[PDB]
Amino acid sequence: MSKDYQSLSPFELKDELIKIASSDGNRLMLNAGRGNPNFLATTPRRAFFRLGLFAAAESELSYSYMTTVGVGGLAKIDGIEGRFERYIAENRDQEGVRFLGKSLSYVRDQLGLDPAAFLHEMVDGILGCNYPVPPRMLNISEKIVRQYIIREMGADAIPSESVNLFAVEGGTAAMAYIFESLKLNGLLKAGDKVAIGMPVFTPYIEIPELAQYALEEVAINADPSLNWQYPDSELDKLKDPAIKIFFCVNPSNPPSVKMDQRSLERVRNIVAEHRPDLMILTDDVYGTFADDFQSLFAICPENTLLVYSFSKYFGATGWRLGVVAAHQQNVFDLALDKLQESEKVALDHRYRSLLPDVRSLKFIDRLVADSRAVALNHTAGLSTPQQVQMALFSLFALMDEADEYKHTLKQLIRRRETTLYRELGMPPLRDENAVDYYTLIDLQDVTAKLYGEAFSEWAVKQSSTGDMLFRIADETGIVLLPGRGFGSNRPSGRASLANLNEYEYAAIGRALRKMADELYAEYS
Amino acid sequence: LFAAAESELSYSYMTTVGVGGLAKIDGIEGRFERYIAENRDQEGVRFLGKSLSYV
Amino acid sequence: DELIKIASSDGNRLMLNAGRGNPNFLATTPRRAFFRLGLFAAAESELSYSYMTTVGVGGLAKIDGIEGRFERYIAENRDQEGVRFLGKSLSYVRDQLGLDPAAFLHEMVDGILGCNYPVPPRMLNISEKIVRQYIIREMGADAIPSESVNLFAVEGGTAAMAYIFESLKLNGLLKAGDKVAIGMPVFTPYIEIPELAQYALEEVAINADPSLNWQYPDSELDKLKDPAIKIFFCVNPSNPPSVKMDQRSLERVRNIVAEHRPDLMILTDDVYGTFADDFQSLFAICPENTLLVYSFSKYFGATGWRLGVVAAHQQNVFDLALDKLQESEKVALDHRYRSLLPDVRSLKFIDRLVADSRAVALNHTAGLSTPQQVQMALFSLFALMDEADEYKHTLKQLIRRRETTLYRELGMPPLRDENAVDYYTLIDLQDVTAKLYGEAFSEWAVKQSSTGDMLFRIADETGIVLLPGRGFGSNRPSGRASLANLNEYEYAAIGRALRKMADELYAEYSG
Amino acid sequence: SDGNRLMLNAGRGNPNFLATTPRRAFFRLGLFAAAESELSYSYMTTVGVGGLAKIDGIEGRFERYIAENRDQEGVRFLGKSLSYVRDQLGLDPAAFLHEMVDGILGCNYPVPPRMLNISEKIVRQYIIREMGADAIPSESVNLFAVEGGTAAMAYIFESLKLNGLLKAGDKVAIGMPVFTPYIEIPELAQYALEEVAINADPSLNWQYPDSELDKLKDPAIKIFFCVNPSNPPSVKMDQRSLERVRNIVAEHRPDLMILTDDVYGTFADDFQSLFAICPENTLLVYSFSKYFGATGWRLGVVAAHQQNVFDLALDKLQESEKVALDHRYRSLLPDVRSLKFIDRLVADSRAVALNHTAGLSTPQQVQMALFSLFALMDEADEYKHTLKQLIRRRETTLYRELGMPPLRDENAVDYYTLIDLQDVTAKLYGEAFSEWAVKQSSTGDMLFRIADETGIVLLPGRGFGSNRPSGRASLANLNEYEYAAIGRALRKMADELYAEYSGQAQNLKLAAALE
């Protein structure tokens, strides 16, 4: 397939290169531009499996008949704290159990929630024996996860009670649901313009283009000379009232830098002074990998729909865990109040089965209903075991006051960067906005640092992206994404610093150094 | 629980937080067989062992 | 001399006889890992012995199926620290270095049993790959392709220097009368060796300047431009001053080699590097001109293990110098190494170190014992796997705590800068007296005492012998302590003794 | 193959057996030591950092470790070790335990450098017993621990040169045949010594004839260099030979230096070293490699008697030579004329100035002391008998189809065995055939046939001067089916030589019946 990559003829060369890839991880980058982590948070997963064993015993205590097979009943909330405290006490030597005991203290003692309700939500939830209720998100899991979201998005000033979440099957489901609900509710109409922060991976460029949404894309271009920050002139394009929504991945993918303070402030001022109606849709999956991250959701909560995925930070791509966050008073609901009477009446009919007064149905709840064709709203929602795992990842981050996990992953990314660039003039100079979950390996910069500016200009002209990607693939079996495009004046390639082990980054550096040495030998 | 151990066998660095790597397919039958042999008294484990035979 | 007499102890004797402070701390996790690995290996060996007997006899461990058996041992012992470390080690080698896991485990098991001669003799295959990653990292030599670094495992830096001077002489790279520039001050043994009649080298001092916090001035380093100086011999971080060469200094040498002395040999002893902040070796700066000697002794608390390596870049000035010898010298060398290989002119200097270490003919049974190479690899893994440098911070904080305890009654520790290492610390009478009672008093006090009075007195009240101050000359009463070999109350006792002496000096002076 | 290459490159067979009890005792001692270190570390920390073990109270703590681990083989051995050192050698038990604990942690430089104090006393008891040197008071023997016999020979030749005991052109008598490395070292240009062969006689079963030993009476021969038991022949010098050397030293050459390598002594029956016969004239080199299957550990010792011919020769150097040595060794002590040769070996091994940090690593010395204790405490020699029976089992397997093993006498060692075609064919088909087969065949065809069918390369039989097709194998480095394959290949070859001899004979008869 290779959609992201493609986005003796030159075409067939590209096809041959794609065929070299041999791992699911390499193919995921070529097809969809995502780096699947090869690390994962184990403590909250062990806590999840240990909670399940406790829950299985709680279920068997509720089965009343002598049975030859394993059948259980529903766990009881009465007496649950004491039974859970016995389980904790009998298993102090099991890491997952110790984590569960601390998480109960955090929720009961720091969040101030009902301990038996928490334990029962977690036990019944991990048994997966009841439909999610309410469908938008389990009650205590929502309060736990939103504390995590607010902290990592740098949105401390927003009172936590003003934030609501819809738990979904990763950012992948969130985007599918959000675009469908914006169309269904007349918030995005045929011909409307969608401003997109670019560069961005292909799936997000593609969604608005679907014929089912007659949308026009307007590029808000990141500037390489500014280390991929969006210049004020680009951000100012958001002033055109024709742009109904600003769609952004922050930290970005592929550049992998977070928006700096100047950029965030610019957007905040454009919104307060010129576009109080602007809808913002931001995907902040990489936030925790940045230093002192602050989301567009923290800056303009009333105008932003935040999409947060747990996939990359917790190494949970296969768990499909995400949330859509909205402030209680937002521009989407303001926009719904402004629809023409004809659209409002059609929506009264569409959601009539949900509640008496549809005009009072908030957009975040329309997302839930639309995700399952409305009529099935009562059985909608993310599975309860998924919500439980999501809550345990959240508690793991929240209870780690010194951010040990976050520091561990950031040092791992830097260690890999050093290994990759060792033989290429060392890692590129970083700054406070660098995230580097993805890295751009530029031929001009590498050859310059190694043999000087003059050799480098002769080198890029002598070479090509295709040449570079082929030499690396042929020697290591790893196919990098084209950094700029096969026709570029500056041959470059991109790799994720999350999906390979050190000797593979070393091999890539060695293949590239070798190519640089042979070019210089010729230039000698 | 077996998979968490498999993931931790793939983590290369010293750390005080629990971090694991991707589980390896090489030698997996042997490690699974050891897990099964050591936990013959746990109901879930006997079931996993028979599942392998069925498949 | 008189000091050892009034204060007898192995620690004191070592300080005066060898100018070294033996660490009183040691890395234990990789040691427990070594002993646990040994228990696994003993069981592997016993199961390879085919006959029944009550006697403890074992056979050779088998490589086939070794990973599965090792994984069972790890899974069965999650509660033994040494075993968990071994489990992480397997992943680091398999997953981060990308080396064959069965080969790594068999090299470690076979190696700890010590049942086979080291092969190749220069260094076991996988231990070399593991240890060079550790060397490259701590020497701050990241820009050097690691496949270009080769190592010869030796019985500590002590064996390294002996091997190196003998091989440089035997191969005509350092002839009697050649000038050797030495970074001074340096401890006595390095002053003495080049001057043995056996080598008869002429020493040229590159003097560290106390007024620059013991860095070498550009004027001193420029002496290297003199072509008669064939080699620059340096301990960095230095012993006794204990500071690392600053950026200005390393760049000065790099320019000299690049612009004036492409042929200069460099021999650097960087055993204290890990105790410095952001250390960078001359090997990282001039890899093709430098023979690096690295000892595991001080950092790991492993003086008794005798673990060291000699590192060389695959393309280096020593082999260029071998290529530039006169043909008649080459012919003599062909006859010397004839038994080793058909084409002696292709024999690299690092492989000559190995052969010369055991009189050439015994080359195939030369090299560091295999259990020593296994322990060296485990110390190296322990540092590589410690991404946050926790062990390093712990030792640095321990050094600082001792320094604070030592100087508490002496005006506090001397102002530290980015190049400070302080494995050895200078206690200067004038400086201490100045901080306590004023420069006026310190100029007087200094004429009232002397290095000998100071040392004899401290040794008599505390049982501790300091190294006499070296580097200024003699003009200044002063002594050096190691912050690595004593416990807190002993540093407190030294400070107490010096303060009392300062207080008596002041009592007089005041009246 | 590495084992095959070792035989070809170094002329030695690496054992495939090893002493495990003393190794388990070493790893268990280490775990005890690690906990001792951790208890001397005073600060809370996340990483494993330890302090130095304390001697105060060490016996009680060690006794608790022993009592709590009665089920671990290594631990029982350790407990008996303490009794042996304390109750039989009469040494300080706390000092012994602290030397072993601090030693195995490898946290202090070896002191004194020549050898740890207690390890030296323990190892010399073992050396004296296995070398058959009991008549020598053990206090009269000093040892220098080194990195195997390999390091010993390098240090010894270098020290003999540096101190002027052997000068260019001096003659060195060498017991032959001997393996290659020892013929090559004396001829290096850096030594330039003249070699004089002392040839073992195959008709004397590889013993040195008196006429050969008598070559030592030549005053120009400064040293006799011998490997005993020998390699490659693998026989120990008999009583007659030892006595001949003893009489020559006593009557004609009181000044003769003897350098003997006795690594194979424990494989011989009732071994006696030249060191036991002429202690004052001999430097003994003993390696632990072969007997304990410890080639990778590199454990060796150089042994010298307190009063020896080496120090006498240093006292007889020209005053000009002593003045130069006064300068070489000045940093070590004030009276260089009192520095004994065994201590110059130590200083010279590390360029003199690094003397105080010279010496074998302490964990190596601890392992060597445990191998020594294991042998000393094995009163009935069970380990030795076990190894000898394994060697004999392999020998039986090798020769089963070759007419059974050759007749062994009281001087046989057979760590290496000589497969002599003349003997094998005589045993299979008679002397007449045997006399004919020795003329038809060659060592080269023997080695090629075996290598061709089995993958195993043997060493050519050396020492004969009358074309005797033969090859040598080590009985220490292969498994039974490999020795069986070697025997099968040889039997096949003997059968083809026989069919041909038989055919020629029948033809000779038919040809005559036609005339």
Ligand SMILES: *Cc1c(COP(=O)(O)O)cnc(C)c1O
């Ligand atoms: C990796 C990635 C995600 C995660 O999507 P999920 O469906 O939640 O796994 C989201 N957005 C971007 C830009 C990504 O690169």
Ligand SMILES: *Cc1c(COP(=O)(O)O)cnc(C)c1O
């Ligand atoms: C302590 C130290 C060493 C270590 O020598 P080893 O033989 O390796 O124990 C080396 N050089 C210097 C300058 C040191 O002070």
Ligand SMILES: *Cc1c(COP(=O)(O)O)cnc(C)c1O
């Ligand atoms: C096997 C062997 C040795 C052992 O040498 P090390 O260096 O001690 O391993 C010594 N001498 C001879 C003749 C040998 O055959």
Ligand SMILES: [Cl-]
């Ligand atoms: Cl657990």
Ligand SMILES: [Cl-]
């Ligand atoms: Cl179960």
Ligand SMILES: [Cl-]
């Ligand atoms: Cl342990």
Ligand SMILES: [Cl-]
């Ligand atoms: Cl044991």
